Design a protein around this ligand. Structure first.
Ligand SMILES: CC(=O)N[C@H]1[C@@H](O[C@@H]2O[C@H](C[C@@H](O)[C@H]3O[C@@H](n4ccc(=O)[nH]c4=O)[C@H](O)[C@@H]3O)[C@H](O)[C@H](O)[C@H]2NC(=O)/C=C/CCCCCCCCC(C)C)O[C@H](CO)[C@@H](O)[C@@H]1O
Ligand SMILES: CC(=O)N[C@H]1[C@@H](O[C@@H]2O[C@H](C[C@@H](O)[C@H]3O[C@@H](n4ccc(=O)[nH]c4=O)[C@H](O)[C@@H]3O)[C@H](O)[C@H](O)[C@H]2NC(=O)/C=C/CCCCCCCCC(C)C)O[C@H](CO)[C@@H](O)[C@@H]1O
Ligand SMILES: CCCCCCCC/C=C\CCCCCCCC(=O)O[C@H](COC(=O)CCCCCCCCCCCCCCC)COP(=O)(O)OC[C@@H](O)CO
Ligand SMILES: CCCCCCCC/C=C\CCCCCCCC(=O)O[C@H](COC(=O)CCCCCCCCCCCCCCC)COP(=O)(O)OC[C@@H](O)CO
Lengths: 368, 374
């Protein structure tokens, strides 16, 4: 089709724009103190933080210019245009919130409230355009359905965020997921539901190419860091395409390593097991590779429920406790390291991307 | 009406939210090093910058929560066009808040800022086309694509028109509040007239803006405890451009922009770099007096091109610019011009004077609109 072709053109041009603009603005970011040190590397220099903003900005630009082409000589259909503009509002709000958060370092409560408020537009569009709240069981979920979507949105913004820390991972898994969703959209295009999946494509192709431009700089050695800007941006874009596309189940299935990491980290997130500020592997100076990390805490003080959960985990061979208590920091990165010992940062990132691809293949096998 | 009542309620709640949250987040801003030095006082301390974002944030929140209330049981056919007007306008405003915040953090160049103003203005034009589409000026000529240009530039004007008229305390938020209040009165008067949907839309976007900006002014007033920054400048300008464009009273609105239009044109020679343009063209405080005096731009005459010398000679002829002899030319901004007309004025008094002049401009606009005695 012409719309998809134009979309691809502007998407490639936007990729070029991102790759070009990142270094042009480096001085700006550095002067603004928007930078962070590579915690998993020996050098202690600063590295541009919240680079996603540039990519994010470009992304918006692209869509802002691409809105008209689907409607060339098309009683105008205000509802599809409403879907587009509302989705763009949600995404823009989320990019803006991520950039703000990185500069300001907001507490978790602030984060969650702003996530919900910025997620409302998705519910607006969904209600006005589609507004179906029934799941096969056939039970009509009602208001709770909206809640679900809401939560889903939040999840997508924060899940990708917590599965981070090693060089190049964030944008990498984001790209794998985006590509899988693109393939799924193209397959289902010939099927019964075609408009939903071409919408998902409209939003996915430019995201894919811009995120690629960002990963170009973010790959090991990381010359830049993407930050909450990008994390929340990608999360919300995925939530949008999945919700308005009516394949949130397939998407969540694409979110397998993310879901597993989130649930695995759930005791720390809820303060059951003490949650350090940074829960990433520790580079061993001698090895030249990433070992696991631990949470050290006074044993007796811990709540009873926490001790019980930790004992269950030790029974299941998930946590390598060294009883003070030194529990193994529970993130997917550290779990891969525990199963396969010390791994180089680049190699570990690559392994994680490959596992994501395997999850996508499993999902495709389930659907088909 | 129920929607306007709910709007007023949530607007007052948002005013409280702003006045409360502004000081609460000061630690975040300071720690992030987002602050500026108060150039018009002897103190050297830092003041949190871009606090407008907070207001902006609250603003968005309010409208995100207010979108449903206009449509209550609004028949199986929902009107997507009023809804898209709302949503597109909010996309533009949010994009603009975001642009101002990122610009204050990054200190972007003029080219970058203007380009992004255009790109963030596109949603407004999309809404206008899909919903209204009229491109005829009653002067009766079809402007065609140029109308879309006009609105575009108009948007890009507003965002910047408030930004350049700044520097003293409370001028940005103050003039923005005067404008918003006058536009609210205009919307209410015209509410009972022929065009009710356009003006109730203007109200929807104006009332919460007025009250959140009031929350910001509470702290921004002299002595300034906060700075609003490009975030608030762009946010306000773009909200105004939205209500005016989609409200179909851009002429009346521009008439409300009399101080800002005059200050923009009067600054035009320096903006175009014909006459050398300093990075800050604010009135220089006098340490002895304690009042604000004019500021000049010093430069070698030889470098100055023929056109610049001509403009300067014309200005001197009209008694608009003071020139001494290298050569120094009075900085051209409405603040410096009022100081030329009235000599030294204290900071607070000068701010209040500019607000009063803004009120007079609004009154003139009402007289012209309704053919009333001045
Ligand atoms: C707690 C946690 O996981 N923290 C992570 C999380 O922390 C966030 O970090 C961010 C910064 C981090 O990226 C730093 O790592 C450095 N870095 C990054 C790459 C790199 O290659 N090298 C490098 O040095 C680099 O300096 C960079 O500043 C940020 O501060 C967040 O505020 C911080 N916490 C959260 O988001 C909490 C977000 C709260 C999430 C709430 C979840 C709610 C979901 C509910 C859904 C449900 C209701 C449906 O991500 C970090 C990634 O490194 C982890 O180290 C850290 O352990
Ligand atoms: C050039 C100019 O006007 N500069 C101004 C303009 O410059 C901007 O300044 C800002 C900084 C200013 O807020 C500082 O003043 C201090 N301050 C602030 C309040 C206060 O109460 N007390 C105080 O001390 C405080 O430290 C604060 O950091 C900012 O850097 C902008 O990027 C800067 N450039 C522009 O606007 C360019 C704007 C480009 C204009 C583009 C116009 C194009 C319009 C075209 C329309 C057409 C298409 C129809 O605004 C300043 C306001 O103070 C002036 O000092 C300065 O002289
Ligand atoms: C529509 C979404 C738009 C997204 C906007 C993106 C820009 C983001 C930048 C700044 C956020 C500023 C306003 C955020 C308001 C969020 C609302 C909120 O969190 O308020 C809490 C409600 O109870 C209380 O908080 P409080 O201060 O009492 O806690 C202590 C605190 O001072 C510690 O720093
Ligand atoms: C839709 C609007 C959203 C607004 C987003 C707000 C958030 C802001 C954050 C990042 C913006 C960064 C990219 C903005 C895109 C702007 C694109 C742009 O201006 O390109 C210019 C013209 O072509 C040339 O450029 P260039 O670098 O070569 O000039 C030299 C330069 O390096 C001097 O520092």
């Amino acid at each position: 089709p012409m719309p998809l072709l134009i979309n691809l053109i502007v998407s490639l041009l936007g990729f070029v724009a991102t790759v070009t603009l990142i270094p042009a603005f480096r001085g700006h970011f550095i002067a603004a103190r928007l930078c962070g040190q590579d915690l998993n590397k020996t050098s202690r220099q600063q590295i541009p933080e919240s680079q996603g903003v540039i990519s994010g900005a470009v992304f918006l630009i692209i869509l802002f210019c691409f809105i008209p082409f689907p409607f060339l000589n098309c009683a105008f259909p205000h509802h599809e245009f409403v879907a587009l503009i509302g989705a763009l509002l949600a995404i823009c709000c989320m990019i803006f919130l991520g950039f703000a958060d990185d500069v300001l370092n907001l507490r978790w409560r602030h984060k969650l409230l702003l996530h919900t408020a910025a997620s409302l537009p998705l519910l607006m569009v969904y209600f006005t355009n589609f507004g179906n709240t029934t799941i096969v069981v056939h039970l009509d979920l009602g208001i709770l359905y909206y809640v679900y979507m809401g939560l889903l949105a939040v999840f997508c913004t924060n899940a990708i965020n917590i599965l981070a820390g090693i060089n190049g991972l964030e944008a990498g898994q984001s790209l794998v997921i985006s590509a899988s969703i693109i393939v799924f959209n193209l397959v289902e295009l010939e099927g019964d539901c075609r408009d939903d999946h071409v919408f998902s494509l409209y939003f996915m192709i430019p995201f894919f190419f811009t995120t690629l431009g960002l990963l170009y700089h973010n790959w090991y050695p990381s010359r830049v860091f993407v930050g909450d800007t990008f994390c929340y941006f990608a999360g919300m874009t995925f939530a949008v395409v999945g919700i308005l596309g009516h394949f949130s189940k397939t998407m969540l299935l694409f979110f397998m390593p993310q879901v597993f990491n989130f649930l695995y980290s759930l005791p720390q997130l809820l303060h059951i097991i003490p949650c350090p500020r940074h829960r990433i592997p520790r580079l061993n100076i001698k090895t030249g590779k990433l070992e696991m990390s631990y949470s050290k805490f006074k044993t007796k003080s811990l709540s009873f429920l926490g001790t019980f959960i930790l004992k269950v985990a030790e029974s299941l061979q998930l946590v390598t406790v060294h009883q003070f208590t030194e529990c193994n920091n529970m993130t997917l990165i550290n779990l891969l390291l525990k199963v396969l010992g010390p791994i180089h940062e680049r190699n570990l990132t690559l392994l994680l991307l490959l596992l994501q691809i395997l999850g996508s293949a499993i999902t495709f096998s389930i659907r088909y």
